[PDB]
Design a protein around this ligand. Structure first.
Ligand SMILES: COc1c(C)c2c(c(O)c1C/C=C(\C)CCC(=O)O)C(=O)OC2
Ligand SMILES: COc1c(C)c2c(c(O)c1C/C=C(\C)CCC(=O)O)C(=O)OC2
Ligand SMILES: COc1c(C)c2c(c(O)c1C/C=C(\C)CCC(=O)O)C(=O)OC2
Ligand SMILES: COc1c(C)c2c(c(O)c1C/C=C(\C)CCC(=O)O)C(=O)OC2
Ligand SMILES: O=c1[nH]cnc2c1ncn2[C@@H]1O[C@H](COP(=O)(O)O)[C@@H](O)[C@H]1O
Ligand SMILES: O=c1[nH]cnc2c1ncn2[C@@H]1O[C@H](COP(=O)(O)O)[C@@H](O)[C@H]1O
Ligand SMILES: O=c1[nH]cnc2c1ncn2[C@@H]1O[C@H](COP(=O)(O)O)[C@@H](O)[C@H]1O
Ligand SMILES: O=c1[nH]cnc2c1ncn2[C@@H]1O[C@H](COP(=O)(O)O)[C@@H](O)[C@H]1O
Ligand SMILES: [K+]
Ligand SMILES: [K+]
Ligand SMILES: [K+]
Ligand SMILES: [K+]
Lengths: 348, 348, 348, 348
């Protein structure tokens, strides 16, 4: 019978914790280096979302200087987007990426971006397993046989495989886990992100193709978990939004400091439309460099606790335990009133 | 032993998500057409609840114009109910339904409604598996052999089967999931709605009889899930209550705009009574046509994500994953303050 | 290995719902009659807690008049307790019970209560499986071979069995589920109440001995569930506290009307003590008769939905489904603002 | 496949309850005596955290007088720490412990503490399975063959074993359950505490080595559970913070009385640092002696309910049931407004 076609149970970040192990690794000796694509290395496993409230040249420069790579968003003219890529390239040999989406008629944007020296092109869609997206990847790969191309987003083994066979240099994973996302609520479609990363990685591992975990990262411990689940690096929006280097001005509202943060599927980013994201504000965070130091500090401390000398060790060898709701509540601060916010644990 | 007679675990909407798949379907090319009954087609898979704060001729007209069908409520005289059915029929060949409940002595209401040209009669009860309800269905089917009859509500395979054998043209499913319902709390009786739809559909599928999923639909993603669970269309109360076309005037209260919305089992709708619903208010929503566009937009986007070309594909082929509480929390917007409500994600 | 000695998973009320079935039963034709003990019948399956903020003669009279039985509390002199039992007996042949606890030196209280015509003696302890309690039961049974004796509380098969072999006429079940109870938090000891009732009943059924489900009943649906789990009737404190007939005066506080309600293990009821209950206030509820009508209305409607003609049918034949947290949230009223509290669903 | 490397499910305090059993034990006849180490007995199973807002000589004296042992913290000079150990020793032959952490260069602190008469040395780390910690234990054990040494923290069987083989006299268990801890959130690493205690004890039991359960104890029932899980005693911070005897002055804030309580991994305790704890305030609690009486009262009442004559009986024979979220909610006080806080159940 099995009238209800339930393929399996799926987990996200708050369903699991990493198990501590024998370790000779110290936090400050952990090696954070990793891969974005088969041919592009990173010194830290962080990439910035291709969103108009997160990544232009300014943030892409600060991030590349810390060892990551920024993806310049496409909500600007072809000329401005190429100028922004070029600005990153002439700021000290830094690497940069750029998003172009998946619609037809992006050829001229793609050509401008390759000419401006873009290191990696992101063909990104809310549905990477769409035949349109797969065909744009094939055409771009035939047109530019040596361009590094990231394609996404998928949330399944099958999708990771279709992207790899279409020619991607990395698979980006995540359908609906984003802070600003309403896709799962408005469509009913999604896969909890830890299960999505692991399913994608089980395929991509076979071809040596890295998986980028995109969306849903809120605390530095979610980075650790995303990597242990199979990701080679993570993509973040909300963790970098609100930084000084992110686009837009600081807004003061009811004693607090904010920057705008919105989904690229929100009515405002898209300009009757049916949106799959919201328009919001995110607490001002100060300089990207300090945020990065705190988040990588957490990852470093995990690598010490797990005995993971390198990111590959965390990604292929660390183990999880599955926890309940009570388990998650124990993991947070509890039964004490906080008198000073820690820089790596800001709730409100 | 098994002293505790637990038949199985049961799931509702927030326990599951739909898995994305290979798709050539685009949202605006998805085919939304479906069946209400074996012989009555709909252009969209939405029917309105037979409630006195949701459906009279006005809403039934607007909905039929969008491709759905409205069920005129029975809290009015036989004459007014027939006049309302007739008003829908002479508003451009629109289809209309009407509720009559299940008590004896409804014969003359039934005759008036058939004469006024009603397309589908709803014999609706809070307990469709009641022998009284089954006998009213049999008598109505012998009296009107070609009248389309919907019978409900049930929440089990056995109940769906008893309704089919009594002569129904469609089975309506749902015991207790409604927004305004206190049945499960006051009686202890109910079945989580995704499991209820799937159990009913496993039976009804064998006879080609559609299942209508009634109650508990809050976001457009719940529509997708209800169909993937086996429903051919959904019935909604609260999603249409508060629209301009729903009965009753707009109430202004503490800066906000409302319309009355109440269970038909509430003390007010029934006039010592023991109620199984409450009397409430629901946010003013504006015109039904825009609400419908947003909800069908979500369903369309699901069909694109799932590669479901038609509603039948979603209903018989899409797959689910089971999620935890943490999974559901990730699916909503999280860790960002919303500055503008999206029209398809209004919380408060 | 199994270092963690976990005997099994256990459930309470909000973990389960009752499945609707074929029914010829109508709510107002359901038979509510049941057994308190092997030899004492009740017209409704409700008994009142032996608490000093719930049951003296006044409430015990009103309840017996509705078909239940009240247990007079022991926080008064032997003489006052016998006078209260006698007052119920001379108010029209009504049945009455009285609590005496389990400490040595209760012989003279017991003799006074039997002489005042008590129908049923409650030897009640927070730990019915205590050897002291079992020996007081044996001695009382040898002293009064025809006195109906209820012993409790237990939460296991083994405990139910030890009480039966000690000579009880009914087993009372519940360790820690009470509204006003902190036992499980302060000791770490308890069994979720639906599992506790079913385990006890699996034993008691073999001897024809009824089980009384004591504590944790909040809504009328919990009564249905407690019986379907194996109870012959339920004992309630908080549902009857705050009624006009319960002991104590109405307190007005911040616009609302209250009566005191406290655990018998609270510091105030016991007068360095280590309490296992709290002192509180409970909303004023009006007359017991109307409360009873609402709660039995819910039970009646369950019996209609489940096709349970008698309480025995509900107790031995109805089936459950296990639900998630999302299931429970769907069961309550949701996504609507309540404008008028229903008499059987008062939250605040 | 099993791409997601999930070793097993893990539980903490709120996931389980203890099952009541046949008992001849009365609360006030229960024997609370236990072991801290193989060679050091305690009269009650409570030790105080080595934190600068919890334990100096003053609290260590009051606790030892009640039958426990206090661990003097190391955020002071070697001389002050030895003077504090000495003060406890000359306050009536009381036992005392002292923390030294795990970094190299602690030799001279260790020598000063042994000379000042410390009974037990705590070599404590946030990662007891670190090779650095294991080597400091070996060196300290070769240097002081008869010094009782506690090593920690671990959360696994493997870790308990590595500590035992390094020479510890007791294993301290807990990675991340502390009130003031953000390790699990900032690193992603941790094990729910009931599972952590049981896994560690399965190893330590084989060598007769006690396990100390450290962190996450909020109510006296958590003590019972920690012992039944395999601990010989518990270590607490927040339960003793805010007592009169704990370090620091009472702070009055918004009508309420507090003392500072902070993680030893917090930015303030450590003085760019990446912290693993927060700085907070905890309600003023009054004298340690009364707190201890309430907490041991709860444990005593558990031993009565479980028929556990001694702590060893609770630790090796008591059984658990696994509960849901609804189970935990039933265990707390519910559906009543508390008018007087009980001394053993203070929420706010
Ligand atoms: C492309 O950026 C995304 C991504 C990566 C994801 C989602 C999403 O909604 C958007 C915005 C949707 C946009 C800009 C409309 C164009 C399109 O539909 O491709 C999602 O739910 O999971 C992943
Ligand atoms: C009939 O409308 C419903 C339906 C469809 C359902 C329930 C319900 O309470 C009412 C109102 C109950 C009324 C009007 C009283 C008459 C009766 O009892 O039939 C429910 O809980 O699941 C389904
Ligand atoms: C006896 O009334 C109870 C019962 C029935 C239960 C509990 C309880 O705390 C009390 C009050 C405890 C009292 C009055 C102290 C005397 C004693 O201990 O027997 C409980 O937790 O489950 C069941
Ligand atoms: C040592 O005290 C602890 C313990 C016992 C634990 C944790 C922790 O963060 C600290 C403070 C961390 C400090 C003082 C920094 C030095 C170090 O790292 O050892 C934890 O998460 O589980 C157990
Ligand atoms: O409007 C949107 N709806 C849904 N997902 C979006 C939208 N805009 C961007 N995203 C995705 O959300 C991610 C950011 O998630 P975050 O880091 O949790 O804030 C982006 O990298 C995209 O994958
Ligand atoms: O008083 C009531 N109690 C319980 N269910 C009701 C009541 N009135 C109507 N219903 C059901 O609730 C459904 C509406 O649910 P909603 O769409 O979640 O607001 C209706 O279609 C009926 O099935
Ligand atoms: O102080 C107490 N602590 C724990 N349980 C108590 C206490 N006083 C009474 N009880 C139990 O709690 C029951 C009432 O539970 P209630 O109906 O949920 O309010 C009583 O019948 C007793 O079994
Ligand atoms: O900063 C910190 N971060 C994490 N754990 C800490 C920190 N400081 C102390 N601890 C641990 O937390 C325990 C106290 O937990 P508590 O009793 O739940 O308040 C201590 O005994 C240590 O094991
Ligand atoms: K914690
Ligand atoms: K989301
Ligand atoms: K409901
Ligand atoms: K309780």
């Amino acid at each position: 019978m099995h009238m209800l076609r339930i393929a399996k149970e799926a987990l996200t970040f708050d369903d699991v914790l990493l198990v501590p192990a024998h370790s000779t690794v110290l936090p400050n000796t952990a090696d954070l280096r990793t891969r974005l694509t088969k041919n592009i290395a990173l010194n830290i496993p962080m990439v910035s979302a291709s969103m108009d409230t997160v990544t232009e040249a300014r943030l892409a420069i600060a991030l590349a200087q810390e060892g990551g790579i920024g993806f310049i968003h496409k909500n600007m003219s072809i000329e401005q987007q190429a100028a922004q890529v070029h600005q990153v390239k002439i700021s000290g040999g830094l690497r940069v990426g750029a998003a172009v989406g998946a619609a037809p008629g992006n050829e001229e944007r793609v050509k401008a971006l390759v000419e401006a020296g873009v290191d990696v092109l992101l063909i990104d869609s809310s549905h990477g397993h769409s035949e349109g997206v797969l065909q744009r990847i094939r055409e771009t790969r035939a047109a530019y046989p040596h361009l590094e191309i990231i394609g996404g987003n998928v949330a399944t083994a099958e999708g990771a495989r279709a992207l790899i066979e279409a020619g991607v240099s990395a698979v980006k994973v995540g359908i609906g886990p984003g802070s600003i996302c309403t896709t799962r609520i408005v469509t009913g479609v999604g896969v909890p992100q830890i299960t999505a990363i692991a399913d994608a990685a089980g395929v991509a591992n076979e071809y040596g193709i890295p998986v980028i975990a995109d969306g849903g990262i809120r605390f530095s411990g979610d980075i650790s978990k995303a990597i242990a689940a199979g990701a080679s690096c993570v993509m973040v929006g909300s963790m970098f939004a609100g930084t000084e280097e992110a686009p837009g001005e600081v807004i003061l509202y009811q004693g607090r400091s904010y920057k705008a943060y919105r989904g690229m599927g929100s009515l405002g980013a898209m300009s009757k439309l049916v949106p799959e994201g919201i328009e919001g504000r995110i607490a001002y965070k100060g300089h990207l460099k300090e945020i990065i130091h705190q988040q990588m500090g957490g990852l470093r401390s995990c690598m010490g606790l797990t005995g993971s000398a390198t990111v590959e060790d965390l990604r292929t060898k660390a183990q999880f335990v599955r926890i309940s709701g009570a388990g998650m509540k124990e993991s947070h601060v509890h039964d004490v009133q906080i008198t000073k916010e820690a820089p790596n644990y800001r709730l409100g």
